[PDB]
Structure 1
Amino acid sequence: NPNYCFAGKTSSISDLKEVPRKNITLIRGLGHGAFGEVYEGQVPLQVAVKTLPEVCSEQDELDFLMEALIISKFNHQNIVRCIGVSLQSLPRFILLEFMAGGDLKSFLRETRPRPSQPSSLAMLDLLHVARDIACGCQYLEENHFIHRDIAARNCLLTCPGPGRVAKIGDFGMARDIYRGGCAMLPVKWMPPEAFMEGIFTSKTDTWSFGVLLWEIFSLGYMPYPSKSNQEVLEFVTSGGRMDPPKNCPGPVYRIMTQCWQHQPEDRPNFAIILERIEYCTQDPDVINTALPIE
């Protein structure tokens, strides 16, 4: 059985909190991802249940185990908690903190201000989401963990409404690399040295965070509109960068462009990103900027 090391500690399958299967009830499907389903469940403690298909390979089993180990070892408010696992019954379960707001990409697209919902979201709401995820990324950075796939689709919200907290929720790329296909690489979130040399550092996540920022302030658009993966690879390698999202304040766009510096040594670490986001939240001209109404 595989081991996992995070910070200054090694953990094993035996360290996962096994929840008796009898104590777990499935309530509803949540839109089941790639390999395996996700359910809202109860243990009463409300959870999201990630399932492993009973029809899977040996490597699928180990991948599922590793994902459980990875998430169970984090301790930060902006990373989704693992309640426990049910690995001794089939299908195997990982039990996560239930984030009623769903994933960030879907939330942004569904919560875009509209003539019907005129003030569904404001600039400060967006800055608070960015700050939350940046605080999660800083925790990973200071613990030497490279996420490799920072993107809106991999972030979750505790709730739809005003008190929402954003958290990093998926660690599948990090799990794969820990031990594939070109077409499955998130190239639109990757810096030049990552997709060219396969070099990953904390500054990898900085670049990806810049792309997340664009997703957030565009309110859920796909990065590099109209461009394919190869077109983006060539665009970005040649120095090309995205334009500001519609109505994006200059101070916010400036953070994106600093995250997208060609040389990793020229990009900010997450402490600096957090400082700059906090300064944007203080600037009335930023937070008084109206978001576009679809």
Structure 2
Amino acid sequence: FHKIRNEDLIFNESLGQGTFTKIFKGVRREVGDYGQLHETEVLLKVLDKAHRNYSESFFEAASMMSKLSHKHLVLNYGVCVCGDENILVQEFVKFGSLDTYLKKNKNCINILWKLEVAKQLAAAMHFLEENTLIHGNVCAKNILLIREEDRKTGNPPFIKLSDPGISITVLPKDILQERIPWVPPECIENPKNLNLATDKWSFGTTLWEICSGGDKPLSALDSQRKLQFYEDRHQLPAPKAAELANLINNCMDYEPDHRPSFRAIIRDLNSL
């Protein structure tokens, strides 16, 4: 990761928090192409100082993801590790996270919009799978809406998959349990079971979010009941708009080896 000086960063408003992180809108002063000076809007992810021991995991998968370039993968500009800070400097996406967008615009999002977003996410995951790169935290909160749909000009929405944050292989067990049903059953059993098949399960959970107007699956269950949901081998309910329900359940297969390739997933989506 390219190193950015704290002096070139301005922190502005808080945009919320992730796991052991705080998120801010900011500005980066930089010299761009042709030597032109820019003041570039950025997204700043700050690891909590109290959790500095997660800094290696905080940067790792993000870095590996940034070693591959792809139109559906978020751009990381670099890191700021001046002083006692651990900061990821990321492109600022105009419309933010998909989960909030789905809820704010539920009445204005139809099946064709959901199908296009599902196809784009599948394309990103197929690219990762072909590169045998595990993401590890596929969820609607980690999908960013670059561009809104514009029916008047035929433009579909356009999304990017963002970074996974600190890996589930190092997070406390109580946090993994709260992340059911995004974290697959084999990873609740053993977080070291994280593998490519992990992302297929979470992708199914993410499709459920996309189809459920930003509802969170199993949000009414506490961690104990989320555990028993997996022990009883339950599946998620079909979303009211159930067009993707079979694909969701096919991806959320309790046998990791039976989860379909993203090539097959893309073929299924194209058939709808």
Deviation by residue 1:213-267 (Cα, 9 ceiling, x = unmatched): 1111011111135333332333333332122101222xx2111121122322222
CA contact (8 A) 1:99 1:157 kept: yes
Which residue matches 1:181?
172
Task: Report how far residue 90 of structure 1 moved.
Answer: 5.2
Task: Report how far residue 81 of structure 1 moved.
Answer: 0.7
Structure 2 portions without partners, runs of 5+: 29-37, 151-155
Which residue matches 1:267?
259
TM-score normalised by the chain length of structure 1: 0.77
Equivalent of 2:27 in 39, 42, 62: 42
Does residue 75 of structure 1 match 2:69? yes
Which residue matches 1:256?
248
Q: How many residues align?
A: 254
Q: Residues 262 and 57 from structure 1, CA distance in 2 versus in 1: closer, same or farther, beyond 3 angstroms?
A: closer
**Counterparts of residues 121-132 of structure 1 (less than 5 Å):** 121-132=109-120
Q: Residues 242 and 51 from structure 1, CA distance in 2 versus in 1: closer, same or farther, beyond 3 angstroms?
A: closer
Which residue matches 2:184?
191
CA contact (8 A) 1:148 1:173 kept: no
Which residue matches 2:4?
19
Between the aligned residues of both structures, percent identity stands at 27
Give the SS at the match of 1:31.
Answer: strand
TM-score normalised by the chain length of structure 2: 0.82
Q: Residues 226 and 56 from structure 1, CA distance in 2 versus in 1: closer, same or farther, beyond 3 angstroms?
A: closer
Which residue matches 2:164?
171
**Larger % of strand: which?**
2
Q: Which amino acid letter does the alignment assign opposite residue 154 of structure 1? A: N
Structure 1 portions without partners, runs of 5+: 1-15, 114-119, 281-294
CA contact (8 A) 1:71 1:81 kept: no
Runs of 4+ with deviation above 6 angstroms: none
State the distance in 1 between where 2:226 and 2:210 align: 19
Task: Report how far residue 161 of structure 1 moved.
Answer: 4.7
Which residue matches 1:56?
50
Does residue 238 of structure 1 match 2:232? yes
Equivalent of 1:28 in 2, 8, 13: 13
Q: Residues 94 and 121 from structure 1, CA distance in 2 versus in 1: closer, same or farther, beyond 3 angstroms?
A: same
Q: Residues 134 and 173 from structure 1, CA distance in 2 versus in 1: closer, same or farther, beyond 3 angstroms?
A: farther
